[PDB]
Each structure stands twice: as structure tokens, then as C-alpha cells.
Here is the input.
Amino acid sequence: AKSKNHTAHNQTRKAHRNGIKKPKTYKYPSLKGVDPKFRRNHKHALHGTAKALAAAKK
Amino acid sequence: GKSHGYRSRTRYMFQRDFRKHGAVHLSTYLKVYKVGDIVDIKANGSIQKGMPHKFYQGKTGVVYNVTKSSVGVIINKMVGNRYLEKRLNLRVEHIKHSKCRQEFLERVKANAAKRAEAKAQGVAVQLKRQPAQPRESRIVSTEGNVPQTLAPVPYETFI
Amino acid sequence: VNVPKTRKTYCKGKTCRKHTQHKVTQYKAGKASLFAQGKRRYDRKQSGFGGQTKPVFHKKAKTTKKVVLRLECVKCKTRAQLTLKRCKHFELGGEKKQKGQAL
Amino acid sequence: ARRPARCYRYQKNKPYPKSRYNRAVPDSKIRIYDLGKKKATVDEFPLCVHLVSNELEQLSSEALEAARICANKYMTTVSGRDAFHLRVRVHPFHVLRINKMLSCAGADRLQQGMRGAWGKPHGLAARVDIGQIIFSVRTKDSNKDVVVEGLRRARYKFPGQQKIILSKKWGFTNLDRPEYLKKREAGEVKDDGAFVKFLSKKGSLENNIREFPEYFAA
Amino acid sequence: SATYPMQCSALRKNGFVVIKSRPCKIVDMSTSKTGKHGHAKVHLVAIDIFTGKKLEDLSPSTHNMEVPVVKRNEYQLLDIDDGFLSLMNMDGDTKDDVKAPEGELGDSLQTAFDEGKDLMVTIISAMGEEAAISFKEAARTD
RNA sequence: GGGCGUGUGGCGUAGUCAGCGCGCUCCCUUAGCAUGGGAGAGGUCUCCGGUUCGAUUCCGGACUCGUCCGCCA
RNA sequence: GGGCGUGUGGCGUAGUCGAGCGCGCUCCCUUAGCAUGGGAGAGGUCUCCGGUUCGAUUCCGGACUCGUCCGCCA
RNA sequence: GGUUGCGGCCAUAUCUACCAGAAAGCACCGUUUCCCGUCCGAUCAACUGUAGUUAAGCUGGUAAGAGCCUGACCGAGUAGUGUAGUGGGUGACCAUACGCGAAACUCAGGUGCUGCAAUCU
RNA sequence: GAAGACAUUGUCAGGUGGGGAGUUUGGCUGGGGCGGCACAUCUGUUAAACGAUAACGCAGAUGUCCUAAGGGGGGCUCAUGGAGAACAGAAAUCUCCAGUAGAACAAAAGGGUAAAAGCCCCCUUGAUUUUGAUUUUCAGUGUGAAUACAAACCAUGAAAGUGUGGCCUAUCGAUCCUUUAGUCCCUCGGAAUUUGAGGCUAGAGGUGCCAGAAAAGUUACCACAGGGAUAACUGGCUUGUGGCAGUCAAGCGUUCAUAGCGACAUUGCUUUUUGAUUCUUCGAUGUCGGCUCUUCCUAUCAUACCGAAGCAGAAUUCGGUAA
RNA sequence: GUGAUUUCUGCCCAGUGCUCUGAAUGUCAAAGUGAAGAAAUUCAACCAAGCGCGGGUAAACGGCGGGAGUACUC
RNA sequence: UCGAAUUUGGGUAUAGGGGCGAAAGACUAAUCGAACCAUCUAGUAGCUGGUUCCUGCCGAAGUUUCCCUCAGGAUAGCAGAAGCUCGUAUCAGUUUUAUGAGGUAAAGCGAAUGAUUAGAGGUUCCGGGGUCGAAAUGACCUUGACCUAUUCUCAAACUUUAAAUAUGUAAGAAGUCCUUGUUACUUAAUUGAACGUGGACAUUUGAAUGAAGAGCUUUUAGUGGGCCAUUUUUGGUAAGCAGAACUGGCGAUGCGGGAUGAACCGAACGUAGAGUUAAGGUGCCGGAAUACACGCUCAUCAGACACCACAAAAGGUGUUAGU
Ligand SMILES: [Zn+2]
Here is the structure.
């Protein structure tokens, strides 16, 4: 009792029903996978920038 | 059985080329990548470390991470019915800058220059590109260009 | 394969925290103790009528085992394990390969 | 014991040459490809006649051998053994396979059917195209009527349709008759064993003068 | 490991098997279908290498049988005393743990050592027990 | 029909781009009871094709022999 | 029915295109038996028919004959 | 413009056979105490710039040169190919419509350009 | 009378025990069985120039090997060919020239590599520790393999740097249980000390039917649920094979291709052979052969009328209209 | 088990069974003995039958081969 | 077969894994390869059959991965429902421009690898056969190798070159430019890196076309046997055969045409009226020209329309038109 092995028939129709949406891009993407020596300094840089802006517009 | 390894069906894809084998030139090591650059991916078979997979050959992506000898690139891969985000760590021998991006930036700076110079007069800048318009009227003359009559040629064997 | 009897490697023994000298042995399993909880449960389950109550493995397929080296730091006596790939022949006695000599 | 040629007439498969993945083929039945006065010079035989296909099919090596023998026998009987030069311009490189089934009674008890039905080599064939020359003969202008009849007798051994075309070239070369005549009146041709070497304006002048002296003798 | 599994159909003649926890060497193999529908059964007739007894067995063909590791090793005699051979390895190692053979092989070896030939002894290892099977004489390097 | 092994001198087996043992034939020796030694001579490497200076051991294709299956309709 | 191979003196048997041996018995010699040996003999249309060659046991084609192998149904 | 040091592109730069090279620079070249390495101060190491030489390296030029590079309406809109027809043909296959468009071949031309620093009749 | 603290009896323990009990006795598959592994993987191709892509498609390979065949550095250039030198020749060692790799890099194949990734030499253990992220297979799970970093500690070199095993693509394994290493930390719940036991983090012992049951047969005495998803008739598609017919004509036929034949080739037809396939039928279409009886086909054995002959007659052969 | 009468029932005890009044440490349970420990416990020695070693048994299950020389012999 | 191992009445004994058997798996109340009765029991079934009113709106899948998985499930996909946040966009089975990537079709072999036909010129301390030679690393021919310049033909697992069709990215406001703040990162160094403050550039704000609203979430059904057509393509002699790729269909779908038919052509459907057509047709059946125009064909088996229901090689002073 052999049967059909594999096909890709109807698959693109199924995809293009409500399919091929591009992913939503955002301002400020995720920083995971970025180098830890860069992120460790970036935290302190933004902390100092926020403190300077708070002291400027306090 | 079947065989789907990591470098299956990559024979002509990862051959080097004709008469440019050997070591790689130093421009690929002297080129500088920053975060947000748009790069093309083309693997170098002479360098076995930091190789991309065969799917990403000829793919174009965006730099998100810069390390000592490699670059992190973001690709959008169609999986099923949507695109997924893929992060790749590739050595710099397998990437180069995309020239379309720098062409577009040249268009941006020349376009801003045109707008800046024509803002002093207000002459309807018309900064959008336009495609190939139909060609307009013209008068072609026969002075020294009298028409030559052509006819179909009869059949011959020609062997 | 052949592995030398000594090796300079890292020791996380809370006083070394560096590469020290290590003497290597091969890991032996040691005898299965009675009064381990699984052994007690197995004996209690096997007592009485009902026959064999747990599976016994038959379809053996491997011919080798992964070898495990027991490293022992010579300074502070702390021990480490590391495994190797599968090998049919293993020895710790160092008879070094020599190149330009006869068969 | 051989299948009819209609089972292998058409180019249905990819080319399957003898290689290091075949390693067991039968040898071809045609072995001689140039015959007649094959050692003749180039200007001995000005006229050239082609048997050329009009089909896209496969010609068997057995059919090539039979047509070669037929045309050679007819022309040597009517015109002499050394009045022509015949050349077979196709070579059987495609290998034909057979999935041999047993012809015994009650064969299905041991046949296994279409399982593992990859064939074994049994023959060799040459794949021709539209307007591809099978046979080419060069002779003098006094043997046109016998070489056309020889090719016409040879055409019966081939499947499909073939045409007999009298070429405009000089012999087995690729120049026209007046082009070759105006080339050979100068010394810029020089004979070889059967063919002829030509002069070019490129190359070193010393070699171009040790060869081909009569043209520079101007 | 000392021993490794194998399939009955993968086994063939002059190969080693484990039958009733004994190292055995096959002399006969025969496969007969169980029933017309069913798989064939393998009958195995083998001889123990150490003791010489004949041991047989019948199994399914797909069944897995245990197979020993047999190593044959070449040594030179030093002395035969008290029924224990003393042997000498290449690179100069010496063992005295081998017991002398007890049969006509042992008798022929004893007479050959008494009349003074240089004797080359083949001893086999399988499953932790050791014995000597054959001896020759060194034709050169006297 | 298919599958799996098979093939080297009188015999038996090993295997480097054909070796030993045993018979044989000689020679020498031992009273023996039994001998022993030294030399030989002997193989299309199953067969047929492509290579190579050396080819079993390089390669490919075929043959012989021994087995095992060829069932249920 | 088909395939593959085979065919030598009265018998067995050797044959690379240029019919030998052994056995039967013809004769002679030879024998204290419990009967041998030795020496000269006879013996083929190389299964038959055609072609090639210069000449086919030898090469080829056909026929005959013999020996193997595979084959009807539910 | 020549030469040296470090290069970029990596034959228009390579290869074969000849010819030429003022000045300077490279180079060959002289030496073995010291550092160092070899069977061998040949390579490598060190010393002198002295005893010499453009012979070679190197650079440039020559060749109906080989190769390589560029271009062509040269082959050729050819081969191939996306779309279409209730097109042809027993078939094999082939024409047409709307589009895209090669390679070999032939011919013509060319034979390194250049960045930084130093130095030169 | 006999026997006697031995038999017997009771409870445990070892052996024996198809006499009996319970159960099992893989999958894929041009039906099943035998065969094979297409069941976990790897290279090239099929594969139609992104990726993906099947068949019991083709050509092969894996369950290993390596303390160096890993890491770093230095020096050198290979296969082959030519020309030479006592023994020394086809092949021993030495010398020169040419040599884009035609060699080598553990193995299958494909890529990659020339002051090297090859050969030789020197020093070593980065084949180390701690957990994260990413790529392939993919559900964007696991496993395997791999990539780039961070924090240490090392190796090597003058140094820049390079190194988290093998130049790259294969070389392998969950829960439960046992055992080892670390923390010597947590718990044994009325309170302590010491054994013992149980936990936490990281390995090993293995499931190859490789996301991982503990497993022999027979049934012609057989049973049930189903299946035309699936074989054993007929019918249908195909016609290799079987049968029949052509075309061409090297030759046979004393001479002479075609009176009669006809090699090497090649074009067809038929479904009275056997295969191939699985479309219909498994809530059944009564599968040998013979007897009986009707009709149809023609590829004509005889009878009717003819043509041809290597047709003198006789006999015969080839062919036509003809069922 | 074989299946009246008559006439015979050959060879083989290696295997599988069956059977010994043989010989005796190889395998070797529980109880018991000894050592260590604070004890749970661990380790040894000793260790019945049966296996293992040694015999018998085919009117027990069964089995009854190859290569040479000249039926016979090796 | 009929004087006994005879036939038989009544009494009596043996009861279901049990009996009894001159042995057939026979008999044990029409039940026997384990009787009958009741209960457990409404035993389980991935398997077969059935499953009850109307209308409206939307509307599939036979595919991915894992499983003793292959007649079944889980998971993803396809679908419905409930909506939520917003109001013309952080869109698009499309094109253009710019820029990448690929190794198929083709082509090539006097280009590498491999196969391969034929001569020519050379090389013999450097071949083999003959003949002449005392012989000769002798000669003369011939034949083989190797080299040189040519020549004929090829490659799924060959390639310098190399399309068409498909395929990645970009075409701005989350942008560009100017100035200068932070840092424990980095640099010889306010050198750079990243994120910032303040300022300038607006409807041609950065190509075309269209937008039918755009984005987001939860939950759940059915499905997980497919099949056909054009083109590319694999195994096979082939098949209404088996297996793949892209698209369109049938399944799930009626209507007009192909006489007839799941898939072909045309066209997709609320209930009606009028008009015009598609594909197909207009002698009659049959609605519609026995229209018009130029030719060809006469068959003692004419021919008559794609899928499609067949015909070839070879021939013919039949006839027509050509070279
Ligand atoms: Zn330590």
C-alpha cells in the first residue's frame, strides 16, 4: 500500500491566503547578541547623559 | 539514504573562480563597517572560519554588531508564511558594502543640493525621479540619407 | 589512542584558579552500593509473585565506550573529569611516536 | 536477441556516456570511420556530398555500420576502391539500457516487477539533430552520380528522414570553391596527410617564411 | 569493551562467537525457513577454542549474538618449567603466566625444547583466559 | 532465475609495481629404533581487457565451483 | 519447444592450419609351474556437406547425432 | 622622468628570444674576531663600503611573438528562452505573434596604471 | 510386632520442572514472503543557474583514527620530465634545470591551500574554566555539529597576532536507575554528634527500529473486524516478449539479386503467448479440462475460378478474389 | 515402540537425552562460622543437591562423507 | 457383516482445560481444536454502517516535523467566530531605476579533465616484426609508443564563457546636514564608537500603479488517501504506469460548446425583463447563408476539426504546382 511521498502543491496558495507579511520594524531594536563590552559602557554613557539632561532641565 | 549536510550542494557555489585563487587582498581587511551599514553576503571558500550557510549567499542585510574579526548581520528569511529575523556572525572576508545604498546617498546629497540652490529662486524644483517617457516629435531628413529598399533573401543550403 | 600521564591544566580549586600540574587516571565506575534508594525500591518490587517487574536491556549496539580522564591537581588535591571521543584502543602509557625510523 | 530500434529511436534520456560510473559497456559495432582513399590529398577530390539528417533522434551503431558497409560496397563496385573518400561524422557515445524481464511461464513468482528497474547497458547510439551531417563523401566531379546513388542506398538503413545535399565547399574544408581556388593559386595553402594548412597574417614572420614560401615569393 | 554484538546473518564461517559464555569458533552454519511465511532460523555449530568441545545453537536470523575479541600474539620461549611457559616479547618484555599445553601439542613442544630448537609460540587471548595454540621454528635469525 | 562465497606448482596455503611447507629428483649422512641435513626442479596468480620499467597484490569486465532460495495463490 | 556444448582406428584418448599413443588381436620369439613378457603388425574417409587457404582435425556456415539446462493449467 | 623603501588594483604587470642602461640608488661583490646557524660562512648570522663589476639580478626597448585585456552594427538578432493560439505535423518536432538575448568565430586596438616618503644630472 | 529421635510434618533456601499458566514474536515495500535498508547520517548528481524538492533513482561513504594526524612559530617546496655520477641496472644515493600543483593534506566525495593548510624542525597542551547568544536540520522543540564574543587562566612568537581539537562539509543518544567530580553546601521534620541515606551543579554507563517497548514459532482444525488503499480470473491501457507482415538488397540459386529464398539494418500490425500495471469487483461475477451447441473473424488446410515458376507431362511451390 | 508366519535386523555413544555404587573443588543458596566496625553492615573461609569432569547406553532420539591409484587398495 | 473383539434394554460410574476415546481432534443433549446457563458486561475496537427542521453569511485540506508511525494521532499550515487599537498607514503573488548573487539552457574541446576518428613531420644509448647482413647501441622497410602542427565527433555526476525565467536589497521624517554633551569602551591624542541636547531643511517628502481599510490578539472546527492538464523532468520498450518542479483546475461546480465524458474550450451561478456576445456553429435532424470568392480531390476500404478515441517505412506517366 504505497502512497504519495511529498509535494509542494497548494503550499504557495496557502501561504498567500493571508501570508507573506513582512516583520514589524521598530525604533530601538533589541540589543541582545551585541558585544557585552559595548553594552557595559553604553549603560554608563546613557546614565551620564540622562543625569546631564536632568541637571540641565531640572 | 538522503544527505543534507551543512555544505551540501555547494560545489560551484564555493569554488573560488578562474585564475583568482590564493590569498585574499588587503582591501577586504582594510574596509570599515559600522552599525547600520547595508552589506552583501558572498562567501569566500579560501576562508573556512566564519562561513555563512548556503542560504545566505547573495543575500543583503544590515550590520547590528561589530566584533574583533567579524560582523553581525540581520537577514529576513521566509519561513512558511512569514519572514523571521536571522542574526549571523560572519568574518569580514565574506561581506562587502552594498553599492545601491551609496548610490542612493549620493542621490540624497545631490537632491538636497538642488533643493538648496533652487530655494533661492523658487523655480518648482521637481525633485522626484521620472521613468522613461515616450519620445516626442522630430523631423528626420534625407540629405545624404535617401532610403535603401530591402527585400527578403531567398533560401540557400549554406553548408 | 595515547594520552600522557600528566597534564598542565586549569584547576578551579578555590586556591589555585590557574593552570597547575595534574596527574591523570582513567575513570572507573565503582561498585553499585546496596541501600541506594533505587536498589531498595527494586528489591521491594521484585519480592513476591509477579516475576520480572522491570525491563532488562538486550539490543546492544555500541562496541566502544567514551573514556573519561580523572585529572588530579598536585597542589590542592582537587579532581576534575573530562571525556574524550570513542576509541577502540586506549592507553595512558606514553610511548611517543617517532618519525624518521624504520618499520 | 536485440530489441527493435523503435524502442530507442527518440532522445528521451540525458546523455549517458561510458565513464567511471558505467565501467561495463559493450563495445561499438562500428569501428572504421574514414574509408575509401583516406590518404588522398585535398585538391584530388573537389566535390563533397553530404547525407544529413532531418530528424532529432538516435542512430544505432549497428545501423551506422550497416549503412557504412552498404555505401562502401556500392561505390567500390561501381567506381573503384580509390575514387572516393567517405567519412562517418557521427560517433555512438550514448549508451542504451535494458531492464531485462524473464520470458518464462510463471515468471511473476520470481520477477519482482518494476522494483529496482534500473537497466543494464546493451548497445550504443549516436544522438543527431536537425541538419546534422551523418555521412560526408568527397570525390571528383565525374563521380557525382555514383556517390548520390551510394548515399541513397545507404539511406534505407537509417530510421527517420535524411537528405542528400551537394555542398558548395571544396572537399572536406570550410571554404567555398572559388574562395579555395583563389587561395590555392597563391602559395598560402600547404598540404598535409589528407587536409591542408592555411596561412594567417598573425604569428612570427620567421615561422611564416619557413613554412609557406611561395606566397612570399611574390 | 571485551565483547561486541553482531547479527546471526552477519556472522559467517571461521568467526568467533559467544555460546554459553564460552569463546567458540564456528565450523558450520545452516539457515532454514521456519514456516513458509516466516523468517529463517540460523543453526550454528561451533568449537570452543580452549577446550575443544562442540557447541551448537539455533536462533532467529535477526537476533543478535555476542562476539568476543580474540587476539593472537607471537612470542619466543625462554624456559618450560613446572607446566608454566616463560615467554619473551618484542622490546624485551617477559611473561611467565601462561600454563604449558597439556596435549600432543604440549608433548611435541616439550620434546622440541628438550632437543633444543628455537620455538615460536602463538598464544591467544579471549574473554580473560589465556592459552597456547601452536608453535613453529624460526627459519632465519638463528 | 537471483543471492553469497570460490579459484596460486603433484598437494596445501601466504601475498611487496608469486613465497614457503609437503611430495618429487639429486647429493651427503645415520648400524640403528628411527634417520637427519643440503640443494634443486616445479604456479597463464580462474579467464579476458586498459595501464606499468617492477602490476596477484593497479584497475575494470567475464568464467568455474560450492551453497542457499525460487513461496501463497 | 527453445538454449548451450559435444562427435578421432575395433575401444579409450592427444590435437596451436603443415592424426600420436595406450587397450583389443596379426604374426614371431619367449615359459619347470601359481602363463608371462619382448619385437616388428593391421587399424581412421578426424560425424557429414560447402566455402576460405596453398592445405583445414584445425577457420567459417549449414545439417545430423549425443549430452546438459529451462519451460502447461487451475 | 630614473632609482630605493612601504604599498593599492593583482598578467595591459606573465612567458620566450635578443638589445640597451648617463647619473644616483639597488645589486653582485670583499672578510670570518664577535652574535648566530650549517655536512658545507653556499643560504642564514656578523664586519668592512674597503679590492672590483654592470657579466647577471633589476629597469626599459624590440617581436606580422605565445598569453592576457578592451571594443565592434564580426558572427548574430543566430542558438537558447518567458508568454499565446481549437497553429502545422501520425509522430519526431517545427513555424508564427508579443518580448528578452548568448558563447565560440572574425576583425581592430593595447601590453601596466598609481599612492606616501626619500633621493638623483 | 517393626522402626525410632532417623523418617513424617511445618517454614524458608537452591536445583529441576512446556506437565501447566500468562504473554510476545518491528517497519518500509510497485500485494505479502525471501532479498535490501532507501529506518540515524555524509559527498557528487538527478534538481529544471536563490532556497526547498520524490522513487527499492545513479556513483559512493559513516558507527572509526590521531598526544599528534591538536595549538603556536621557523625553514623549505611538491607530482613529473630532461641531463649527468663507481659498483648501481626500470626502481637505492647525490647534482643541476624545467615544473600553477598535474603532489600531499587519516578515511568516501566535493571544495580550499605554494615564503602554505603541504614536508622537516623547535616549544607546548586552548582537546582548559564559567555560563549566555547565534547558524543548520526546525515546530524556528530536542539531539548532533558549527560560528562570533564576554570573563579568567595559559601556550607560542621578536611581535602583530593566532589557538575553546582535527583545513571545511559525516563520525552519534532523553526520562527513570547506578556511579563519578564539585559545593563540603542543604535535609533526615521532638534536640544533638557520628555512620548511612536523600538533594543541587557537571560528566559517564544506552537505547543503530538511532525523539529511545523487556520478547520464538506453527496452524491444511482455525476465528473476528475490515480492505478492492492490497495479490490470486476476465475485462481495460501498453506490446518488451510471443505471433504475423513489410521496405533495402551483400549473397544462395550451374550461369542469374528478387522463380523460390535472403544476411547486416530498418518500418509496422495483432491481442489466440507471457510479462508490466493495479482501474473495477474481497456484505463472493462459481478460475482446469472434457462433453454438447450456436455464431463470428481470416492471417485459406480442402473445394471454385485464376496469375507466376529453376510450370515438358505427372507431382509440387509462390500468389490473387474468396469464410 | 514395532505390528501374523518365514528370513534377518549391519556400522556409529561425537551431539541431544537417559543413566552410574567414580573423583572431588572448579560453579557453589539460606542457616551457621570467623574478621573489621560503635552498630546497621561489609568482607572472607566453609559450602548440600544439581551443573562442570570421568564412564555406560542406539528394538533411546537420531546419523551413515570426500580425493587418488588399479569391484579392490591407499 | 451375520455366533461373535456380536447386538441391545434397564440400573450404575466418569463433568468442561475436565471426562471418555480399537485415536477421527472424534464424542460429551441438532453445540466441540475446550459444552451449556447466568453474571462481570452497555467488555474493548486506530475498523464497517447510521446519525432526524429551514434560510442567510463565510468557507477548506489531503502539505511540514515527530511517533512500533504507514487505515491512527500530536504539531504547524488552510477556515470560522469574538473582537481590540487606530483612521489611509511601519502596505502589495506588480512594474521601473540602481545594485547584488547563481552555473541551468546554450556553447567549447587546434582551452584544463575524460572519451574519441584519420592521416602528416620527427625521436630511437630510447620499442617490436620481417629482409639484407659474419655480427654490430648494424642497415632497409613495416608496425607500435612518445613529441610537434593539424583533423572528425562527445560528456547527469567535464569546463574558460554563459543567458531567458525566477531571486536579495534600496528608492528618506525612524531622513540629511551643522554645532557640542555622556562614558568605566576605544585612541598617542575630544581620536573614534554608540546614544543624545540645540538649529536648518515639508507637500514633487524624493520612481510607477493600486489600496478594497491598516495593524494586533484569543479560541476552536474539519483536514493530514488526492487526482487531472500545459510546460520542465526521473525510472521504464511502454502504459488510462510509477515518482518530482511551477502554475491552473477537478475534488467542492452548476451553465453554453466538445454527440456522449470530473479535469478540455468559453464562462463561474440571488429572482426576472430587454439587448449584445464568448467558445462553438448556420443542408436536414437543429436555432442560424444549399452565402460569396479562389483553387485542390473522385477513393471496387474517400474525407470531414484541438484534448480524442491511432497509423509508419517504402512506393504510384493518378492529378496539380514547382526546382
Ligand atoms: Zn589545584
